[PDB]
């Protein structure tokens, strides 16, 4: 599962040259979410007399 924002830092416009800041954001970070399974079980019996 992905993450969102993502904050781009505005630049006052004194300079030219590129000369571009970018808020130093992680290019590819993701989150694993993992699932697990439980088991319900029962037993019954029948005696050889009833």
């Amino acid at each position: 599962v992905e993450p969102d924002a993502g904050k781009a830092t505005w630049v006052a416009a004194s300079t030219y040259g590129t000369d571009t800041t970018t808020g130093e954001e992680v290019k590819g970070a993701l989150k694993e979410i993992h699932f697990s399974t439980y088991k319900l079980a029962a037993k019954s019996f029948i005696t050889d007399e009833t």
């Binding site: 019954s44 019996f45 029948i46 005696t47 007399e49 009833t50």
Partner: protein
């Protein structure tokens, strides 16, 4: 008792069992004084003879 098992299967109390419609009887004493002597027919109330 009748209510068996009780861990764990479904078992009832009484009135599960099959009933029978035949009637039995013990060997009664033989009938002999009521079926030995001779009958005399009559037609009134008292009979007289000489």
């Amino acid at each position: 008792a009748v209510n068996q098992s009780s861990s764990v299967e479904v078992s009832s109390e009484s009135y599960e069992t099959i009933f029978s419609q035949r009637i039995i009887r013990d060997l009664q004493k033989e009938l002999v004084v009521g079926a030995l002597f001779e009958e005399l027919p009559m037609s009134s109330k008292i009979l007289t003879m000489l």
